[PDB]
Design a protein around this ligand. Sequence first.
Ligand SMILES: O[C@H]1[C@H](O)[C@@H](O)[C@H](O)[C@@H](O)[C@H]1O
Ligand SMILES: O[C@H]1[C@H](O)[C@@H](O)[C@H](O)[C@@H](O)[C@H]1O
Ligand SMILES: O[C@H]1[C@H](O)[C@@H](O)[C@H](O)[C@@H](O)[C@H]1O
Ligand SMILES: [Ca+2]
Ligand SMILES: [Ca+2]
Ligand SMILES: [Ca+2]
Ligand SMILES: [Ca+2]
Ligand SMILES: [Ca+2]
Ligand SMILES: [Ca+2]
Lengths: 144, 144, 144
Amino acid sequence: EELQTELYEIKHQILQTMGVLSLQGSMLSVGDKVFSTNGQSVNFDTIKEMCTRAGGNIAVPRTPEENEAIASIAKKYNNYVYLGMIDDQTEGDFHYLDGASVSYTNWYPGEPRGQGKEDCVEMYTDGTWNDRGCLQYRLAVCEF
Amino acid sequence: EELQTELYEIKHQILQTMGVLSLQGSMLSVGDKVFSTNGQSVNFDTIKEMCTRAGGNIAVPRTPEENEAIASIAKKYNNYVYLGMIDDQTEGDFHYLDGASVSYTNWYPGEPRGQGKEDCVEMYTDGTWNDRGCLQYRLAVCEF
Amino acid sequence: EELQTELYEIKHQILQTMGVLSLQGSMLSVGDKVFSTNGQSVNFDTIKEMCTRAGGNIAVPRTPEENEAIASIAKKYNNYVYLGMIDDQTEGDFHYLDGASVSYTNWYPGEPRGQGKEDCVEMYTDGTWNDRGCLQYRLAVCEF
Ligand SMILES: O[C@H]1[C@H](O)[C@@H](O)[C@H](O)[C@@H](O)[C@H]1O
Ligand SMILES: O[C@H]1[C@H](O)[C@@H](O)[C@H](O)[C@@H](O)[C@H]1O
Ligand SMILES: O[C@H]1[C@H](O)[C@@H](O)[C@H](O)[C@@H](O)[C@H]1O
Ligand SMILES: [Ca+2]
Ligand SMILES: [Ca+2]
Ligand SMILES: [Ca+2]
Ligand SMILES: [Ca+2]
Ligand SMILES: [Ca+2]
Ligand SMILES: [Ca+2]
């Protein structure tokens, strides 16, 4: 019976810290997912490690709203973003990093194409996607 | 019995994140209320939306200590602050945004006056209040 | 039975806020300890008050890993760091601020020495320690 008062305070305090981080542009909240960036431009492998170290994962949009959030960060920092998906196994079918087949997509018209040996996916500042090599310097955006 | 250990860790972690935000000037804590700003100067309506989007509300002091906190942010950013109170209905009696009548006040001597058509309230950098129109650019301060 | 869903969401949200603060360099997490700095260089007494106001304490490393974390902040800001330990009572034996005798140490070779009247401890940017007077301007690093 004293849990409710205890749980309320906990939930309230969490709302406060999330409110502050949100108000100050430190992160974006979309449903249960929080997106954030450290502002750095590094390669795919480095991004993965940065996100993992923080306890999260390299961002990947699974809905238009999530896609738009990531896109907004992309245009805010004026940089393309590496997404949490690859097709290193067989070309054409992309997978999330857990192995599951990609469902929601937002390819720029004609994409994926050009290759060949393009295993990664980048997001343009308008939110559309392009398959690309994994060694370029791109904005690190993480999901928690 | 494993809740206590679980609740302790949760409370501890919350204290940590609040500690960090507090240490770095990201927010101010006064009792159960957290104040924060994104540093922007915008009109009354815009401030309201900014705070609401972050899950909070435009700040309003109900005690001298809360008033002093907001005042400190005001002088830190060298800007006046719109407060969460209006008197758009009948002139003279101000109300919080939920409708309740304003209790604690800190009017600069002679205020409210001048109008007429001044429905909003701004805080000077010394913490005293002035009634003012709602279209000026003022520091956005939110409470959570 | 609805606590699990409630506790999960709480734990998840906490992970999110800690993830964001961590990703952005706002703090360092080592075991159960969080380290953070406001970037300011002030004396020992001022640091203590700054940390206490934020709900934490002036940092003190009790393991090599904690020592390395603090050291990284030290070299990041290119400043030496006052640690949460003193020997104001009798010279030679240092104590944590709760009174307990210091266990883990990492003195630079030859230290402590020179004095005499050196009651505080500073960390060099390589992580080694030096006993020093308590009135110098040093990076404020707090633990939560
Ligand atoms: O499909 C695109 C396109 O061909 C680009 O112009 C090229 O720079 C990239 O290699 C590729 O990802
Ligand atoms: O009462 C004040 C005062 O008259 C000010 O000098 C004026 O600039 C504002 O209109 C008003 O809020
Ligand atoms: O032991 C050291 C050493 O002697 C330094 O060169 C001196 O600047 C300090 O007084 C002391 O902490
Ligand atoms: Ca390909
Ligand atoms: Ca392509
Ligand atoms: Ca009026
Ligand atoms: Ca007036
Ligand atoms: Ca000494
Ligand atoms: Ca010495």
